[PDB]
Design a protein around this ligand. Structure first.
Ligand SMILES: Nc1ncnc2c1ncn2[C@@H]1O[C@H](COP(=O)(O)OP(=O)(O)OP(=O)(O)O)[C@@H](O)[C@H]1O
Ligand SMILES: [Mn+2]
Ligand SMILES: [Mn+2]
Length: 339
């Protein structure tokens, strides 16, 4: 969805020493924790925070601390920021003081500086198993699947205290959307509506679980959104044989809004009552929110759909369907260096 805010002006939170490493210290930036050089910031200072996945073009003047990690990526020379562990200290992102960015002297706390600093987004490769023939743009009348990170929602998490959330396991696969709009039924990946052919994985998942017939039956303008997971998709964390679709959302095209967890669970039951075989992402107990970002992140480690593997994380969706976010497990990002 759109353009992610990879580089933004943010405020130095609590600064804590790293025992046994005098030259560095730990800086809290929103719900992120970042290793910084001793002295670069005091608590309350502003800086440009670059999130993990930032791709930072080689620059020995501005980004000398990245020199050793410069790779070749999409025909560009630069550095991919990723989760790391230093001295036993979890570190994610880069935080650089404002006087490194004279062109940002008149900007404000909160501003997105991704474009102006020419930062781009690194991402894992698409499973060429799932790059299909493109029929069309992702429909403008359906929301792309997107969840903000809990680390970026400190004030929101505060505000939602007392609110109840559906908790589901975050599956690591590829987003897929199967929808009906009047006389058209279509299957999309994360970014594009796809043509049906013999080798198209998403179309095949949709036929196999009878989800097009399912949409024909409900006779509503609805987009069924879920994760296609399994063999040859993002390394197959779940150790499935073959591939399959797990629903996580239903988007009401005529109303332009997501269905609430309750409405969504009812439709899935009716679908399955009528023989349409739609599986859902694993649903945990509802959570009454009363937590810091750090506590939410602790919860995110745990078993997956396959209980013998550690999950990518958890997705929280408010019972009214209008607020949601993801807590990616930091254990998972430490275990999986291509994440
Ligand atoms: N239980 C779930 N609830 C909602 N989405 C889920 C769930 N399980 C897996 N997903 C997938 O999680 C994705 C959102 O988080 P994810 O980190 O995978 O996004 P991304 O597209 O890699 O974007 P970025 O990493 O740039 O933020 C959705 O696009 C969807 O495909
Ligand atoms: Mn991602
Ligand atoms: Mn994903």
């Amino acid at each position: 969805m759109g353009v992610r805010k990879l580089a933004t002006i943010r405020t130095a939170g609590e600064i804590t020493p790293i025992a046994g490493a005098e030259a560095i210290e730990c800086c809290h930036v929103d719900g992120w924790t970042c290793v910084i050089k001793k002295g670069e910031f005091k608590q309350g200072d502003r800086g440009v925070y670059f999130e993990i996945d930032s791709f930072i073009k080689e620059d020995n003047d501005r980004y000398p601390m990245l020199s050793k990690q410069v790779i070749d990526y999409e025909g560009q020379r630069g550095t991919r920021l990723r989760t790391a562990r230093l001295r036993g200290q979890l570190s994610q992102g880069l935080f650089l003081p404002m006087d490194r960015f004279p062109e940002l002297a008149s900007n404000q706390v909160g501003d997105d500086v991704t474009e102006i600093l020419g930062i781009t987004k690194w991402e894992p490769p698409i499973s060429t198993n799932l790059s299909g023939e493109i029929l069309g743009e992702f429909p403008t009348f359906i929301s792309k699947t997107d969840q903000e990170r809990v680390q970026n929602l400190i004030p929101q998490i505060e505000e939602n205290k007392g609110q109840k959330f559906e908790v589901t396991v975050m599956l690591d696969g590829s987003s897929m959307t199967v929808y009906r709009k009047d006389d058209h039924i279509g299957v999309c990946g994360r970014n594009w509506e796809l043509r049906e052919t013999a080798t198209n994985a998403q179309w095949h998942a949709a036929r196999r679980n009878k989800m097009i017939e399912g949409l024909q039956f409900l006779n509503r303008n609805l987009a069924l959104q879920g994760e296609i997971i399994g063999e040859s998709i993002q390394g197959n964390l779940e150790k499935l044989k073959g591939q399959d679709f797990y629903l996580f959302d239903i988007y009401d095209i005529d109303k332009a809004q997501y269905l609430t967890p309750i409405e969504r669970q009812s439709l899935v039951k009716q679908l399955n009552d009528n023989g349409f075989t739609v599986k859902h992402v694993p649903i945990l107990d509802d959570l009454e929110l009363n937590h810091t970002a750090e506590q939410i992140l602790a919860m995110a480690d745990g078993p997956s759909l396959n209980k013998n593997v550690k999950r990518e994380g958890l997705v929280f969706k408010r019972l009214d369907g209008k607020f949601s976010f993801k807590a990616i497990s930091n254990a998972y990002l430490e275990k999986h260096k291509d994440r």
